[PDB]
Design a protein around this ligand. Sequence first.
Ligand code: HEM
Ligand code: HEM
Ligand SMILES: [C-]#N
Ligand SMILES: [C-]#N
Lengths: 153, 152
Amino acid sequence: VFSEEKEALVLKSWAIMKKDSANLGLRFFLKIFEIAPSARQMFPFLRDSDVPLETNPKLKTHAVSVFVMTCEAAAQLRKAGKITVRETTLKRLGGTHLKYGVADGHFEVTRFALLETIKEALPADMWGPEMRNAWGEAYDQLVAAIKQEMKPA
Amino acid sequence: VFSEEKEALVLKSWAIMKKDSANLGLRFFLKIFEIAPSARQMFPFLRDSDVPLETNPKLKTHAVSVFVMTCEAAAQLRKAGKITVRETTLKRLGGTHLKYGVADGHFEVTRFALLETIKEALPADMWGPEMRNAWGEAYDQLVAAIKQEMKP
Ligand code: HEM
Ligand code: HEM
Ligand SMILES: [C-]#N
Ligand SMILES: [C-]#N
């Protein structure tokens, strides 16, 4: 499923990050774009501006939205017994990502940027291999739920 | 061109790293595969092995070779006035990376993996935005030189 031990690691870390989600959501996306600058081109609101990424107001709104959706899905994973998303559905997410040509490589880059952002966000006391694994696995479940809706039938 | 200052930054860092190029070259490749595990499937000696990535004998040899080739290209960039690649040719590298299907996204990931590896190889004191930019720009010149030979 998603173990009680992993739920606890997710819950205590999200307890901290949820209070700085504006900043962390943006740092998450900046880190994606540092690793893969080509990814910038996929987002119309980036394609249509030249302001520093750090300054782009539509990026901030979008970034926090996605980061919050991701962390909320991880935080409810055990309680709900499945991936849940608020404000949208897995079918809509799958259709959108398919249309925008999001590939396995994009998901792998984003997984790493998320885990590097969470590592930078958390007290050194609570960072470790268990924490990294709990978040990576919750992310993996989320992506697999999206990919179901990007493949036939 | 490539400035005297950028050369100096590359030279004093490579002076440290060259003493540890085996370990560093593998660190560099493990970081590539950490970020993008699908890149593993590009390397036939990875696709066909039983053993963990970290222990693979062929990976170690390949990793040191690319790491050294990259750092020497950067170390020689100003002196030579252009990108050189040791024991080979830009035409051969281009042909090879074209044949194995290496794409712009692979070069982006690998750039980031190189810069993190180098950061972690250097005292926090030798690091900073100009050091990062010197290496990033040398890497960018190396990649542009290779890509020239992957296109008509
Ligand atoms: C678990 C991972 C992901 C989640 C939960 C997620 C979620 C979302 C959501 C909620 C939207 C719609 C936003 C809106 O209402 O406008 C969206 C749009 C989009 N996503 Fe993702 N996404 C994920 C991964 C990715 C990845 C890896 C990429 C590529 C690096 C990506 C590229 C896009 C693009 C190009 C759009 C269209 C942008 C737009 O709405 O104008 N997404 N994503
Ligand atoms: C600065 C960038 C790079 C340099 C200097 C470089 C250099 C090399 C060299 C020297 C070889 C050996 C060719 C031979 O033995 O004939 C090689 C092979 C190869 N490279 Fe790269 N490479 C670079 C980037 C990449 C990237 C970004 C990828 C993909 C993530 C990649 C994938 C491959 C593959 C699949 C091979 C063939 C594997 C094999 O030799 O069996 N390389 N590279
Ligand atoms: C997806 N943003
Ligand atoms: C090329 N490795």
